[PDB]
Amino acid sequence: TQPALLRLSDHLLANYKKGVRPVRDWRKPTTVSIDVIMYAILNVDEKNQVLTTYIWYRQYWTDEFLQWTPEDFDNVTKLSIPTDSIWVPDILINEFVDVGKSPNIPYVYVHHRGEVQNYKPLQLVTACSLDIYNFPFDVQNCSLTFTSWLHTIQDINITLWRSPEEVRSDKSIFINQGEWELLEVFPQFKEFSIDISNSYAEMKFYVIIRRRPLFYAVSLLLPSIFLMVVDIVGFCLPPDSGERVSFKITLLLGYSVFLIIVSDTLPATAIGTPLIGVYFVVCMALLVISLAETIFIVRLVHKQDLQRPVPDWLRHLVLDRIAWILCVRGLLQELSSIRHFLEKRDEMREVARDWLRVGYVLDRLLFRIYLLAVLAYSITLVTLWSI
Amino acid sequence: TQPALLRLSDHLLANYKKGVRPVRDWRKPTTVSIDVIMYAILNVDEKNQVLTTYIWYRQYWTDEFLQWTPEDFDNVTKLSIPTDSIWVPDILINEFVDVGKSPNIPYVYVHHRGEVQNYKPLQLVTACSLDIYNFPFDVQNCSLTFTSWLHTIQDINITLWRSPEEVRSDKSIFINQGEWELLEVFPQFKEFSIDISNSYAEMKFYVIIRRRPLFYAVSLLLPSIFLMVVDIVGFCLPPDSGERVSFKITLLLGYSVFLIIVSDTLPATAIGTPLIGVYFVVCMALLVISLAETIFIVRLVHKQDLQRPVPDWLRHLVLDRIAWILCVRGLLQELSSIRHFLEKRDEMREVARDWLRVGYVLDRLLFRIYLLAVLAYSITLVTLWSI
Amino acid sequence: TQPALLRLSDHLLANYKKGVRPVRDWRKPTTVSIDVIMYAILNVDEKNQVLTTYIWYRQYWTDEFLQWTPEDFDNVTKLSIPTDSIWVPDILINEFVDVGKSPNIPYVYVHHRGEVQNYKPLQLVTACSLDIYNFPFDVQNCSLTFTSWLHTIQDINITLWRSPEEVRSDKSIFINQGEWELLEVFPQFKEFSIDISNSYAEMKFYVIIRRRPLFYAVSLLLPSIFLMVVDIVGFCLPPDSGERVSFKITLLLGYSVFLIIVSDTLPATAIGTPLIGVYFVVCMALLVISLAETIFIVRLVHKQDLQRPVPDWLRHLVLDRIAWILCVRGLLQELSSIRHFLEKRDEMREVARDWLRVGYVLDRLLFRIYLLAVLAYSITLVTLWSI
Amino acid sequence: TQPALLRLSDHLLANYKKGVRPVRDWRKPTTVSIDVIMYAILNVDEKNQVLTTYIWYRQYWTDEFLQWTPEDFDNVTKLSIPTDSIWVPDILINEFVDVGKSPNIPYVYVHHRGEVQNYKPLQLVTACSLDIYNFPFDVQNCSLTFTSWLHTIQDINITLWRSPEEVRSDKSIFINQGEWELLEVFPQFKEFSIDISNSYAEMKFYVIIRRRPLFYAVSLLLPSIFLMVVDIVGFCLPPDSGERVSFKITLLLGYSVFLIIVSDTLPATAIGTPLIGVYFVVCMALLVISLAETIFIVRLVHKQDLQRPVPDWLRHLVLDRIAWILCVRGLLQELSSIRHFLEKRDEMREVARDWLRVGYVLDRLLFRIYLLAVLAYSITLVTLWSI
Amino acid sequence: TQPALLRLSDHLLANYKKGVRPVRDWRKPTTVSIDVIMYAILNVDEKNQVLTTYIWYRQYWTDEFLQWTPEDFDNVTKLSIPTDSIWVPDILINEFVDVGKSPNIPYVYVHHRGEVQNYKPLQLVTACSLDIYNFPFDVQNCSLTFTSWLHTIQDINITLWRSPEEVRSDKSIFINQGEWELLEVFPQFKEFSIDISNSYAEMKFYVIIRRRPLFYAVSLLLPSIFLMVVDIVGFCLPPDSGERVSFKITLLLGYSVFLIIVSDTLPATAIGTPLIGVYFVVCMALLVISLAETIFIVRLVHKQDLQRPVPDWLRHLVLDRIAWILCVRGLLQELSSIRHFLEKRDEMREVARDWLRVGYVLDRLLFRIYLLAVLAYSITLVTLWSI
Numbered sequence A, B, C, D, E: 001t002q003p004a005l006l007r008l009s010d011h012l013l014a015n016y017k018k019g020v021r022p023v024r025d026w027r028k029p030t031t032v033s034i035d036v037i038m039y040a041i042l043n044v045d046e047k048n049q050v051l052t053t054y055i056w057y058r059q060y061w062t063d064e065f066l067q068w069t070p071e072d073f074d075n076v077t078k079l080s081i082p083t084d085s086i087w088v089p090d091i092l093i094n095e096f097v098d099v100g101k102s103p104n105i106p107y108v109y110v111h112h113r114g115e116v117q118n119y120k121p122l123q124l125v126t127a128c129s130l131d132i133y134n135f136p137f138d139v140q141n142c143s144l145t146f147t148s149w150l151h152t153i154q155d156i157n158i159t160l161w162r163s164p165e166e167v168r169s170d171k172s173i174f175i176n177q178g179e180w181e182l183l184e185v186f187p188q189f190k191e192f193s194i195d196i197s198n199s200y201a202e203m204k205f206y207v208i209i210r211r212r213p214l215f216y217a218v219s220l221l222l223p224s225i226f227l228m229v230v231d232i233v234g235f236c237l238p239p240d241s242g243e244r245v246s247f248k249i250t251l252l253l254g255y256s257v258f259l260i261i262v263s264d265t266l267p268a269t270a271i272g273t274p275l276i277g278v279y280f281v282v283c284m285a286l287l288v289i290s291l292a293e294t295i296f297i298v299r300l301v302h303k304q305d306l307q308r309p310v311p312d313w314l315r316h317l318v319l320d321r322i323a324w325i326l327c328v329r330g331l332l333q334e335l336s337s338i339r340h341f342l343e344k345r346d347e348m349r350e351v352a353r354d355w356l357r358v359g360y361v362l363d364r365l366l367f368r369i370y371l372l373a374v375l376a377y378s379i380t381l382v383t384l385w386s387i
């Protein structure tokens, strides 16, 4: 008769049972050609170690029962038929820890030689072993283990759909300008066998991904070096004035809550510390020895009516280190008492002058070393950033 | 017989198979007319670069098998029939990264000439390439790539349902008073072809959206200019009194945690910085040079029993810059000693008077430049806000 | 026969097709009586402008095909039959932006005259145009636009199920003690027509809801007035002592982070500011002029070895404003020098006495105005709270 | 024949329609015996007033159509059959505001006398009227209103499955060591009737639950009493030294952000305040009067070159309150001037001695009252904690 | 005939009803062999006491109806058939408080002897009784109670699938480098019976899990010991200088907000406190007695024109404790007055010298004990960390 191609659609699917594996010879395995286009990196959760991606996915297999001849069917080559009306392999991921809601595709492509072509996009929220060691400059290596969850090698076998170098190089459409940058998707086929004489069909896909170290530059180093340049200005404040600790203590307090707020950036991975704590606790310790310097010089110079400067450390500091850094009436018994009391204040003032004198030279010399130390530390930072 | 229009409903759908593509000639493609009304901008996630919207969506195609004649069927023109009882095209979005739960519409409209009219609202949570460069004044350009996910150009072809200028101008019902303001929805048809002799039907929709710069005005500039007007009052505090750093340091501390709290407003986009950090770190650096000024003048004036003002910088500052800013008994050997000690304090007081004198003129002159600088900086801010 | 009422259940539903619209005459529209009981206000999201509620909902229509006679069926009046076995109208909401999961009711009520009674509770997460202008005292007006999403006025028409005043007054069961208090649910019927000779059936429901201004009283004004009463105690601290700025600056700092924390209470609506920022930035500015007062009086009184009080402003302040606020040997040449030096300190002390004298009267007079200002400002606050 | 019990399974369910209510006489109501085991309190949301629990639930009713005789069926007593193959009552909760995903149980128990036994666990996220008045020691009373959502008293009637005292006392398995402790689950049956001659079957279950006041003890009182014991140490700091406000102001600042952080513990219920704000703002006000004391004593003692202590308040304080708390040459005209100037400083020093003297006695006496006040306040706290 | 193995697939499943329990003799119970591979620990929620895991799960039972002979069926051994076409036991978990979305496996394995092999991975979000007593070093013991939710011991009985020691030792694939480390999964079978002559089939699985104490080391002790090493440097600051409280108070403030931020790490479990608060409030109290020391020494030394050092405590401190820590004209009547006034200042200066003298020795001696105390406290900390 002549109503449509609809005749063919009935005749093939009249008694077609979608439950039995489609082979005329049951020993011949059904080979499923797989193809991956990685569409987008949604989010990495370093805390739970689970990566969520979106994949444009494809399936190709051979159904020997629905084959027909192009002739006497009005030369039709391929036909679209509902997915839930035909046998479908159960390819999923072993790393599955959840189910992303992805649009359900109702149709598949069948040609006259019995090949079924199945396209569907899937959202996989899968667990991945992450190494966050070099936090700003990290490459990450996540496994995507494709398997039929039950079928054997004599039933279902996995092959590539095309040449494995192009899928590696495939950067066709992937959304850039995000947190992650795709380098390559490396395919690898393997026979896994958890049980003796029971091996199941596996095709590993190593997608290796690099973070873009821009958000974590500004959010980490910029206030940090800011806190450095404010303190260097602060060293110029004289210690005797009394504001010397009041500068630094509020600054150390400011650095304390600063490191506590940024503590919720680095993840709660129980593998240990990130390496950037080393690049930060050095800076933390740097302020301590600055603080240790600060109270020391305020401990030296003060008016406490105490000891005179010992000559041994006067020549070493006020002389040697200065050159190194630069390059009858009874009225008489009462008048005698007043100047005697007077010169005692003048002498303690003489004490006040010399201890103050050494301290400023000491303050300047200890100031010189710290600025040179940070600049040398800074030149190490930028040479590491360049390499 | 005469029970109802129900007769027609059976007779058409008696043997109607919803699986085969509805054409009497299989080579003639089924043309699907699409129509978009963008209903609402739900939320932009700049972090993951994914935009979620709600669309009032429509479908129009031709089913040649369910056509009938208005006569002998009691002059019925159109009939409502269940969606899951007829063939439905698989139009979805390539940018799909998730599935929004949207009400499932059970019925579609069929007229006697076989045209199927399908209305359904859909929630699309789709990834979009965002450019957040000019953060308060940004236009955003997001793609909505409509496609049949598998069908060819010889099966499914995409056309507009009406004239493409009205859908552009369509601001009919869209919810304003939100974070985003709709400018236009620009449609564009294209033939995409990832494979040779395999092209698939595509209709791009560029919806271009503008943020409303009101929430980010108050939340950014108002405390910022507030922190400016409190410091200008603070410059009037005398440096010798000792409170001079205590004002500014707490203020700089206050500005430090202020910028850390607002750091979680700007997103974690790894494309680099927003431009508003330039409009902010300038203000940040402005306080530094204020702080640098502050400790400098406190370094100048202090009572440390040291050097007298050099005349070369006395004429340049206390004289030139002042005019520029304004426009036999042995009792004698003891009495000789007391005034000698006395005038030493008076002389260091003479030292205390002159160094204090220059500093206040210096404080006032350096004060004049900063207020003029901020006001000039402010007049640049408002002229940019007007343009 | 006599097995049960089950006979009737078969006989009616034997050939009953749930797909065709149930009318013997196709031109007669099926009228759907709607009824609303608003059960609870779950949450308002001012950010995205979307209101989520729970409704106890009802449907009433006429199915002319399943009518029967009470006689010869053992006098049965009504019968419960599965929802998915009969035709159901598609009434939904145009404001739908999402789908709340609500229990699916499997059965409906059918009486012998063919009326189908459908009860089901639904969770609607719908977008609503909000006006948060008067933030503590706001009434909100949200639309619930009920429509058949496709059917015409000749097929489906919407009526009330009972008198529209009772549903307005309906406060039967609604959960109080929550964030929102139900005033009324105002129904309104309208014919909307987006297209010429194509109008679709609409029944608007304006539910108008009021917030309960109790959580936002304590969370806003109580620490705010607290910060006021601590500063009034602080004005009594003498400015010369040096602690004068140290009080207020920490207090201004405390007020700075206070306003930053409460900044995440008011929503990110891009319609502009809430009005309560006016009721807050006034208080913010109030501390500034207090701070401006504070440094001013500390700028007046200090020991800087400078100018004497000018008489013109001495009579205006120390005299006029005080009454307004209250209501041969050569030993002689050396002894001459010591008192000469001595009286210079005594004279600068004389300078220290008078400048201090004016300042305290000045401090007290400027103190009087501010307390009267806040109390007058406070009496404005409570008279607004009463109205 | 003899294949299995499968014969019975067919014979009963051959023509069994799951849509019609299972009664041979339609007037006899189907009585559904209900049983509740409350398994766990998941979370209380005081903000939205909605309680989420997990219930082990049971259903018992009578199906007169599937009854059979144990004989000639190989003495089978009960049989397991799929839930979706038989009629199931629609018992749900009126307080339903959402749907928790709970495992779907596929089978039910049928015995030969036609009784259907239905077990299924359900997750109910239901709205509950909460009273958070006594925040640490609260009992909460939540309603669980079980109803058939449509069926009448002549169709479905609700009874207990066993004696109502055991379900009350039922603490069998419930998970302790959580935020909530189960006291009892009180059942109550009632006929509700919203409409005249239309009453629907209701069985109320009052589960009354108590919080465990341990997390909120440490998180509230421990830092609070800590802030008390640090201030009592702070009162010993002398006011003249200048650090007196600097202690307390930072402490008051610390208490200010402390109360702001703990402000997000108490919920946003619009019923008013919790009672614990009274137990906290008293402590808040306690520091104010301490602060008021602090600036007062610093206002008393200072060196401002002003008034002498009035005798009336010298006897009342330095005398009475002290005992209460404890239990020819012209050289002469110049020499005359110097001591005259000298004794003026000594006299103002005499002023400095006496005003300082009264203040410390005043500081100690005002110190005594505050420590006794807090200890008395503390003894009130612990006697309330014991009762 | 010879089309395929498809013949067998029909012949077995032609009249196979998936609703009746598959036994030829109804008294013989169907034994379900269970097997567990625990795949990953997703997240522990100590707040609600609910553990979420992912399990690779297996089912094994015997279907006596679908048995066949390998001969005359082309020697086929096993066959894959759809899950929803055969009877499936209802094994779930009693601890279920929610439903995780896990991929639905469509097929199961049937061999010719009638054994059905069911593989499926499941996500179980289940409530677990947690003991967080030793917070960094905790072992946790969670129950996984596997049961058929309704079937009796005469219908369904639970056995292991293999030897119970290997499943215990099974560390095959589990994802390490996470928050939790798998020690063992201990299986145990038990007959539970809530009702007399009604016992239901139970197999308990105790998985015992250990946290990895690395994230909570750095996040707790590192800033804490940091706050210790900054204070020890702070003790060297002299108390007379006035900065003595200003150091510690800001530090105590810094420690106050530090403990408030880390307060949201420990959970809100109402079982009481964690033990680590003891290891922290000791450190908290340590700063108090440091603060108590700080104000004490500032209370001792000050210039208040008061009492002389009593000899009894001078020998005990300045002598004994110092050695323990180290190892005619009328001009005369006026001149008489000036030195008399002069020596009064010198004498109060003599008072200023001695009280200052004792305090520094006192400051140093009290300094020695605290450093030894923390180091002894520290050596207790590290010996506990080693054990």
Ligand SMILES: CN1[C@@H]2CC[C@H]1C[C@@H](OC(=O)c1c[nH]c3ccccc13)C2
Pocket (backbone or CB within 6 Å): A035, A036, A037, A056, A057, A058, A119, B094, B147, B148, B149, B150, B194, B200
């Ligand atoms: C319209 N869509 C466009 C083109 C057809 C449809 C589905 C998408 O393509 C793929 O399916 C492929 C992904 N990766 C592949 C690799 C080899 C062949 C096809 C694809 C993008």
Ligand SMILES: CN1[C@@H]2CC[C@H]1C[C@@H](OC(=O)c1c[nH]c3ccccc13)C2
Pocket (backbone or CB within 6 Å): B035, B036, B037, B056, B057, B058, B119, C094, C147, C148, C149, C150, C194, C200
């Ligand atoms: C009741 N609803 C009202 C009117 C009918 C129903 C569905 C909505 O309209 C649309 O479907 C359209 C959206 N965009 C369009 C463009 C051209 C024609 C129709 C629509 C709003």
Ligand SMILES: CN1[C@@H]2CC[C@H]1C[C@@H](OC(=O)c1c[nH]c3ccccc13)C2
Pocket (backbone or CB within 6 Å): C035, C036, C037, C056, C057, C058, C119, D094, D147, D148, D149, D150, D194, D200
């Ligand atoms: C047990 N439930 C109780 C009473 C029957 C069942 C369903 C609920 O009532 C409604 O359906 C109505 C809501 N609003 C209405 C308005 C008019 C008539 C009925 C209702 C509450």
Ligand SMILES: CN1[C@@H]2CC[C@H]1C[C@@H](OC(=O)c1c[nH]c3ccccc13)C2
Pocket (backbone or CB within 6 Å): D035, D036, D037, D056, D057, D058, D119, E094, E147, E148, E149, E150, E194, E200
């Ligand atoms: C294995 N599970 C165990 C025992 C059977 C199965 C289901 C649960 O028990 C219940 O269903 C009951 C709850 N509450 C009840 C009250 C009276 C009778 C039974 C139950 C726990």
Ligand SMILES: CN1[C@@H]2CC[C@H]1C[C@@H](OC(=O)c1c[nH]c3ccccc13)C2
Pocket (backbone or CB within 6 Å): A094, A147, A148, A149, A150, A194, A200, E035, E036, E037, E056, E057, E058, E119
């Ligand atoms: C491909 N997948 C690989 C191997 C087959 C498929 C399913 C997984 O294995 C299991 O099902 C088992 C888990 N635990 C077990 C214990 C004994 C036997 C099998 C398993 C991993």
